[PDB]
Amino acid sequence: YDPIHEYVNHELRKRENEFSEHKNVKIFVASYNLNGCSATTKLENWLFPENTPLADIYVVGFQEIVQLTSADPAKRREWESCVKRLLNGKCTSGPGYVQLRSGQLVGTALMIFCKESCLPSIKNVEGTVKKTGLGNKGAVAIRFDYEDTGLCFITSHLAAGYTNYDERDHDYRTIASGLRFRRGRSIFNHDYVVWFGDFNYRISLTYEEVVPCIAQGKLSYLFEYDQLNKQMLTGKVFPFFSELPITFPPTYKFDIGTDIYDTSDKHRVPAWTDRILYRGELVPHSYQSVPLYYSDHRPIYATYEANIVKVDREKKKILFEELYNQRKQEVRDASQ
């Protein structure tokens, strides 16, 4: 410990704008449990929902690239190709989007695209995956630094089942402790973390209670029975993560191609299985489900503005040493 050092850091924080530049980066996070459906570029309502500018970074997580009952890189690549075509299709002028990196764990995949103009700012991209224990479930993660700001994105597909939220919570833990990039870097060592996907948490009511509530718009009531909200409130899972309020209906268990909830004999209870949570000072904007009908789940997305900092380390180390010496000198003269 050095008092003079603590001093300089305090002073330097006031003059930060002398060695730091701040920029806002638009991030679009999208998630979709495909139920094994085929790759397609017909995803406009999902990736360009708004009437807003294209994002700087698109982070897309898929679950069940192969429907669940051994990892298919080809299928994943088709989705990658479809997304890239869609993003670039919107860039009718100049440079478009490039795939930074993608990761895959069985049928769960994560792919990140950014505008080419963002590339020079993106560094130390690392990826990893972690399967769940207690299989085809788990997580895929990718992190990177945008200038001097660290970002980590995680998509996952957690334990299925109606009442087994204990297993889901264990999955959270297995993944949060088990995901390690290079040199043991963890997911928490970042300014912004977005963790999302098919967490599989359910609404703890029966099918007959839930369906008319959703038809009548009683989402708040249904939310009181949502397992994820319950487990997060207690801090057992996703501590320090926030979720924007949910204003869209349960994204799960639709007869394929229709607005209708599971009319199969299985009579699965609707649920908000698909979610996007964030940790850190991101500025959230939207959080919605989109009407795509290829799967028994609706896809969802969330948007964020992420403040980025670019620090001139040279200019900063100079002021530090300067303020440090001036202070060390002020201390010398005072002792005379």
Side-chain angles (χ1 to χ4, degrees):
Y1 175 72
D2 180 42
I4 299 175
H5 199 296
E6 187 176 319
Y7 166 78
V8 188
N9 282 316
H10 184 269
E11 283 306 306
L12 229 45
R13 287 191 201 187
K14 293 166 186 176
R15 311 204 302 142
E16 259 178 30
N17 52 279
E18 285 170 55
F19 57 79
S20 315
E21 326 169 32
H22 290 73
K23 147 166 174 69
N24 242 31
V25 164
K26 289 153 163 177
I27 311 190
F28 193 96
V29 173
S31 192
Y32 196 7
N33 177 310
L34 306 165
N35 191 35
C37 69
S38 312
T40 166
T41 57
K42 304 298 179 204
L43 310 169
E44 315 68 40
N45 292 157
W46 173 42
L47 266 19
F48 309 119
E50 34 40 56
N51 168 39
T52 71
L54 294 173
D56 294 306
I57 302 174
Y58 283 79
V59 172
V60 185
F62 291 107
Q63 303 82 39
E64 301 207 38
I65 284 172
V66 169
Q67 182 186 55
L68 302 184
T69 297
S70 196
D72 187 325
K75 281 179 192 292
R76 179 191 87 231
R77 289 196 167 102
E78 289 177 69
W79 282 109
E80 287 179 6
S81 171
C82 289
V83 174
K84 179 188 292 65
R85 236 172 299 158
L86 203 61
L87 295 186
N88 286 307
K90 303 286 275 190
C91 297
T92 48
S93 171
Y97 287 81
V98 293
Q99 173 172 314
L100 187 71
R101 199 210 266 219
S102 74
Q104 186 173 5
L105 179 65
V106 185
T108 297
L110 183 64
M111 56 194 67
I112 302 188
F113 299 83
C114 63
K115 293 170 171 171
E116 298 191 61
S117 63
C118 296
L119 279 192
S121 298
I122 294 170
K123 296 279 171 286
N124 310 310
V125 179
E126 292 170 17
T128 199
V129 309
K130 181 60 176 173
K131 87 185 192 310
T132 64
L134 213 275
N136 310 317
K137 299 304 199 313
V140 175
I142 296 165
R143 65 76 59 196
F144 59 88
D145 293 305
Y146 192 108
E147 295 297 348
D148 299 279
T149 299
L151 297 89
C152 180
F153 296 89
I154 309 126
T155 190
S156 302
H157 191 356
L158 314 179
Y162 183 61
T163 59
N164 59 321
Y165 59 85
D166 287 331
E167 171 165 26
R168 239 118 45 205
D169 286 357
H170 168 244
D171 280 354
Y172 164 76
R173 294 186 258 106
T174 297
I175 292 159
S177 305
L179 237 22
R180 299 285 167 184
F181 299 99
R182 310 186 59 194
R183 300 175 59 224
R185 181 210 299 280
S186 89
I187 62 167
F188 303 108
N189 295 145
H190 296 89
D191 302 281
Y192 312 129
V193 185
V194 181
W195 188 335
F196 66 95
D198 182 349
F199 298 164
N200 250 319
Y201 285 89
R202 314 295 176 87
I203 292 181
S204 307
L205 293 168
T206 56
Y207 183 98
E208 15 301 303
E209 294 170 279
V210 179
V211 169
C213 285
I214 107 102
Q216 291 166 44
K218 309 310 198 173
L219 305 185
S220 297
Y221 169 80
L222 289 182
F223 196 67
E224 304 172 11
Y225 289 87
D226 172 65
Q227 292 164 354
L228 182 57
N229 176 60
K230 187 171 174 224
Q231 300 311 281
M232 289 177 61
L233 286 185
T234 70
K236 307 186 211 160
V237 293
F238 305 97
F240 303 103
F241 280 81
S242 294
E243 185 182 32
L244 231 34
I246 293 173
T247 60
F248 50 91
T251 55
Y252 171 78
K253 213 29 153 153
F254 283 102
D255 289 346
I256 299 164
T258 78
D259 287 319
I260 298 175
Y261 285 97
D262 187 17
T263 56
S264 82
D265 72 302
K266 295 283 71 214
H267 280 149
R268 301 276 179 178
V269 182
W272 285 287
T273 45
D274 308 287
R275 273 142 104 186
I276 301 167
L277 306 180
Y278 68 95
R279 190 208 259 210
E281 298 313 303
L282 288 174
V283 175
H285 280 72
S286 300
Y287 184 27
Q288 284 304 325
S289 64
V290 159
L292 281 192
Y293 299 85
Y294 313 136
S295 178
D296 52 3
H297 282 69
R298 292 276 179 271
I300 56 162
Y301 71 93
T303 51
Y304 302 95
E305 273 185 295
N307 181 262
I308 255 43
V309 186
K310 179 184 183 176
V311 180
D312 187 327
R313 304 293 174 174
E314 195 180 19
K315 196 185 297 179
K316 181 190 168 184
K317 203 263 172 46
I318 284 173
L319 288 190
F320 183 91
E321 297 304 322
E322 193 190 89
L323 279 280
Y324 189 92
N325 281 326
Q326 178 181 60
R327 161 53 54 137
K328 208 162 75 170
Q329 177 80 309
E330 284 187 61
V331 176
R332 301 190 192 99
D333 314 319
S335 303
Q336 298 167 22

